């Protein structure tokens, strides 16, 4: 929304990212197919309002402090280990990544794994390669644990394969297609011919699939954990495979070493069709942060976003010290200006707040100046 | 989550709602299979903190103002015309409906409508019934979806199953389902589509968004579908495009009664029988979360607020929208010596609602609560946890 | 696949048809965007071995007999009202149409009908256009398919994708696709179905198979769809069932036959059904061009509309074909001919009709003997035409 | 109906259901396989025998039979049956050709999904301790060669996964869904990200996928052969794998054992039961030998009238004799379908006549030299 806002994109992010940026009115783009050298990065990033990078660019504390106009960082990938998160945060610079771009990919893999495991293909294949010398998926029940981005897309594909889909989730969800939410996990485990996990990594899920749960699964069933974490007690999984209670499994990958001996287990390890989704996803985050201040899904920043309801919108980033918010609201109160919406979120170190006001530019601009002055302020900006 | 919080459910909402309420720790439930007479409703709702009803129960201003403990209203259906929204709002009472349980039926409806419209069936059928004597496959056709949310995504899935190519336009990037493709400019989506279906909310950004200009950008001989909305399409313009034959047909909802190639579906806000379970789950969920964390997401007569749960203490304040409320709040926490961890204030009409998370002990939180209730213009405030 | 084989195509058949012919080695093609006048037609179809036409071409006996090289006619459409079937048959000229090109289109139509009928849209729509003022999801419902053939099968696939449970009744055992289930007894399929769709041909076994008794057997509040045909459903019984509300609605392909239904707002009457646009045109083009190619190369008359149907698998050797009047002695004459040449018949397929017979014969012999047999076969009394396919 | 049905190795209850459905009662069932002594005893008066992969139906056992009309192999196909001995006796052997269609289509989907992602190789390495392809299926093109039972069901599943389906066949096929026929094999091969073969085993398919065909395939593509034949030239495929021209493959079972990016593979008994039992019944009723594995295939449309069938040694003069019989009797032949195999000849003849005229032609047909058997079907 201004050709003065410079976007520096390196390591060759997908073209759709550029298409998205231009459609939103941001055409001041410096593009690079490969990584920049230290000296090249420093001079290109110096006046960049935004930088988009992948895995090879190292955004160290020094490079960041060197950038004098940096507003936000877009990690066009899932990982952000190449970016110094804390350094960016201290300067009020959010880092966005692409957390859901691999959704479809994981769903397809699960389908491929269950189809072959159900037929005992992995074991037959390993023996064939050594010189040594089974059911249809349709009509079978798939039990999905975690019915979110991946869980829902998987259920859709499973139904297309003629499977009956059931899911367990700690939250009530709207079923897509003929899927059925099962309230008790043990009930899901009992019915399921195939069980697939798609939950996040947290105390709630730590070893949720232990000896007991695996014991609850149907005799001859399959356990899939296509996306890597710590949700499955590997030793317990190994015992159930050795005992043959489970006819096979697929686990994302030592730690899985106990499974290496099993021919009926599939062990599987940002360079494919993911680039388009990533380009669209991350450019979108940069665009929205620029236009409306949304930090939803930022990885090193308090998360906030507010619907577009007209009026003027300002944003304030500050060290989380008592008195800042009081100073902020005072600016509008002592002036009789009304606040239509306000959303503040904090961390131990920082506080981020977006405010919608009913006023004209003059007042808005004036308010912005006062805001920047408030002690503890890191950055302040008038969004519209 | 207390067992003293009374839930009054009338007109026989699905048993799943009760199970859900019980699972959330709410067991103080009065349940009736049907509607009650004016006398019974008044007696039953007098001490009800929450009421769940359907289309028959008339929750009028009188009834509302008489219910002295009412905290929230849940319409276990889509419509809320039987509920006096403004009356409830004035009392700081949000009204929740079931905005998503009927997602699937709207998607199925659009598929049925486009399939027949494409073949010219509505027109051929109307003439056939009048005695007057008298097409395209959907397969390989492009479906343009405006608003890729709950309905758009499900519609896209069904359309791809019919062999159609799905493209969509939205005001933000959306993760696509199947082979659906996002299109950055609305004009481009309109240009390429053989069928355009609208699935967006009602609000200044969508009022008449499909006007004479947008409709003329649609492909010649295309179809426009507005399955369940309100004021998104400029009717005069649509009639004009139909008369000129720019569009081969449409489905909506008049000046359109003259067109045999237009399907008119008088009121669709009706929830299906198969959806009663989902509705019970959906609306009970809304009441529960409002009661527990103050979320007013999806409320139909209230500013929408929702703050992630990060422990600590949480307070909520409903008031007359005006400058100085927030400042009045800051001073109270300052005097009380507490820092605000998170805050979310939204306004709608002449009303303001704000949820505040603070780190403080029970006593301090209560003292803050009493002060907050004394702020002039305050409608009500409570300590959620 | 020689070059002396001419293809006359009028009324602009789809390019796919030509691509198909060429790929098959038939390049001698005379294309025309539209129909030709009586003078031009006779002039063009003069030395044409094959002709492909549509609806705007009248192939009369005069035109046909005028043609001295015509071996087969391609009607790139469903109907063949425009061609003199008997005249072609008398000349030993088979007529091929596009029997299954509209399969997908009908299956799509059924889905659209049941979706709207299930929600009561036809009725609400009719009332709305009149000023008068004013429902179940398809997902989870059971679809009962009577006749699991071309359409039945594609319909079932679309229904399952819509989340419906598919069951079908057919007089012959079928390999179900997806989760489809074959039901042995009609009464059973009829009792369990929320929607029943008919996709059977018009023969004695189907004549009014859906009578008052069958309809009464249907689940109360169900839908009946017959999106093609005309003799499988008893309209009077249907109207009664709709009047009593035993059925919630219906879709019937339409007319004195459907008049009893005109008063029902919850019934969809749909005329034109057979020949969409470029899309249906592409299927048709590929289908009929294929028929012509197969007839030319191996003598197959499967699906011909005015000819005995014969089709013999390709097993090498020499292939001859003989078209004749159904008079006695022809079959005997054929044998005698091969005995004298001391040739063995590997396979023979003869089929007949009114007063005409068609036989394809596979023999073991050198071209030399083949051609000698061909000439002999042509001299058989009652012979209309004979050819050496390969 | 003195039509005894001997069933061994325990065929699914459905076969029994089916036979009964057609009145055909009299069923000697044996959950297990009988032996030489008992087998000859039970098969002695057996009209139809149903067996699996273990029964050894030798020339002796068959010769032992005296009323055997057909043999139903309720399995992947013929097994320990002396097909040749069976044919000599004018006895067709029916198997279950399309019963596991769905199963093969599902297998191909599973294989291409993993191969596209390089999982086979990654998995092989992971099981050897080593650590370290990869693409989604949606948006990719699947090239099917042989658009028949399996090909069509495969296309349906492929499209549901978001793939674009193209197929090549030797005749025009009605496409299901968005499947598109491609006229030239070379075009199909080059455009495909995945090629799967579903063609019959015969001369026109033997090694049809050679060095030339494989070189025409897109670089980094996958070749899948679930067929039960030798359609692919392994030596050529191996070369294409070593050179990385192909990113992987899946084949039924070696030179490919060295390739980690190659998949090597080996209750539905209900289908088999209903399919095979269905062949046995149709043959008894209308004489159809469609799909028989050791018999000329003949199938004639039921158009009323009388239907006579004749099985004979392929001696010249049989057809001459047959047609002379009807000629002399002044009986018109409505339809006639004769097909032959290396040793046998089978013809079905439809005529317009009453019982009298029929049985008259039947006795004369039985008297022809080379006759193995002849029956009045109806
Ligand atoms: N989607 C992607 O692109 C991607 C990429 C890499 C890794 N992952 C990983 O895959 C997993 C799932 O990802 P997603 O995108 O579908 O996540 P998601 O957030 O959309 O859904 C996770 C689901 O799990 C449910 N859940 C949480 N705790 C649960 C519990 N204890 N029991 C049952 N259900 C519970 C949640 O309510 C939610 O519906 C996560 O571990 C994620 O980190 C996803
Ligand atoms: N889901 C149901 O059961 C149901 C029942 C009756 C009526 N409706 C109506 O259908 C509409 C959409 O419902 P939904 O469930 O899909 O809602 P939703 O919130 O899930 O999705 C609406 C989508 O519209 C997009 N959008 C918003 N403003 C837009 C604009 N100006 N231009 C383009 N896209 C825009 C949003 O980003 C979002 O993705 C609403 O008007 C709703 O009242 C829904
Ligand atoms: N497929 C098309 O393109 C097309 C175009 C125009 C009209 N039609 C009409 O649609 C109908 C069906 O067409 P189709 O292409 O699927 O035909 P089809 O021949 O493929 O299948 C008809 C099915 O009906 C079954 N059947 C026959 N008699 C039966 C009986 N008495 N009871 C139960 N099942 C019986 C048959 O076994 C077969 O499976 C026919 O009336 C046909 O004329 C089809
Ligand atoms: N369907 C099953 O259950 C099953 C089980 C085991 C093995 N098989 C094997 O799979 C293969 C195909 O099985 P199906 O059931 O789909 O057979 P099918 O007969 O239904 O289809 C084979 C298809 O191949 C086409 N074709 C023939 N020769 C061709 C050629 N040279 N090039 C291209 N296409 C050609 C045919 O026209 C036909 O459409 C066969 O080898 C069969 O023995 C099938």
Swiss-Prot record, chain B:
InterPro entries registered for this protein in UniProt: ACT-like_dom_sf, ACT_dom, AHAS_small-like_ACT, D-isomer_2-hydroxyacid_DH, D-isomer_2_OHA_DH_cat_dom, D-isomer_DH_CS, D-isomer_DH_CS1, D-isomer_DH_NAD-bd
Positions annotated to bind NAD(+): 150-151, 170, 227-229, 253, 267-270
Enzyme class label: oxidoreductase
A GO CC term attached to the entry: cytosol
Source organism (scientific name): Escherichia coli (strain K12)
Domain ACT: 314-385
pH dependence text: Optimum pH is 8.5 for the reductase activities and 9.0 for the dehydrogenase activities.
Residue positions of the active site: 229, 267 (proton donor)
Similarity section: Belongs to the D-isomer specific 2-hydroxyacid dehydrogenase family.
Sorted UniProt keywords: Amino-acid biosynthesis, NAD, Oxidoreductase, Serine biosynthesis
Physiological role: Catalyzes the reversible oxidation of 3-phospho-D-glycerate to 3-phosphonooxypyruvate, the first step of the phosphorylated L-serine biosynthesis pathway. Also catalyzes the reversible oxidation of 2-hydroxyglutarate to 2-oxoglutarate.
Membrane-traversing stretches: none
Oligomer status and interactors: Homotetramer.
A GO BP entry: L-serine biosynthetic process
NCBIfam families recorded: PRK11790.1
Keyword set includes Oxidoreductase: yes
GO function term, MF aspect, one: phosphoglycerate dehydrogenase activity
The EC number(s) this enzyme carries: 1.1.1.95, 1.1.1.399
Protein name: D-3-phosphoglycerate dehydrogenase
Source taxon at top rank: Bacteria
Curated annotation (Swiss-Prot), chain C:
Reactions this protein catalyses: (2R)-3-phosphoglycerate + NAD(+) = 3-phosphooxypyruvate + NADH + H(+); (R)-2-hydroxyglutarate + NAD(+) = 2-oxoglutarate + NADH + H(+)
Assigned EC number: 1.1.1.95, 1.1.1.399
pH-related activity note: Optimum pH is 8.5 for the reductase activities and 9.0 for the dehydrogenase activities.
InterPro entries: ACT-like_dom_sf, ACT_dom, AHAS_small-like_ACT, D-isomer_2-hydroxyacid_DH, D-isomer_2_OHA_DH_cat_dom, D-isomer_DH_CS, D-isomer_DH_CS1, D-isomer_DH_NAD-bd
GO CC annotations, alphabetized: cytosol
Activation/inhibition comment: Displays feedback inhibition by L-serine. Inhibited by glycine.
GO biological process: L-serine biosynthetic process
Pfam families: 2-Hacid_dh (PF00389), 2-Hacid_dh_C (PF02826), ACT_AHAS_ss (PF22629)
Domain of life: Bacteria
Subunit structure: Homotetramer.
Record-given protein name: D-3-phosphoglycerate dehydrogenase
The organism of origin for this protein: Escherichia coli (strain K12)
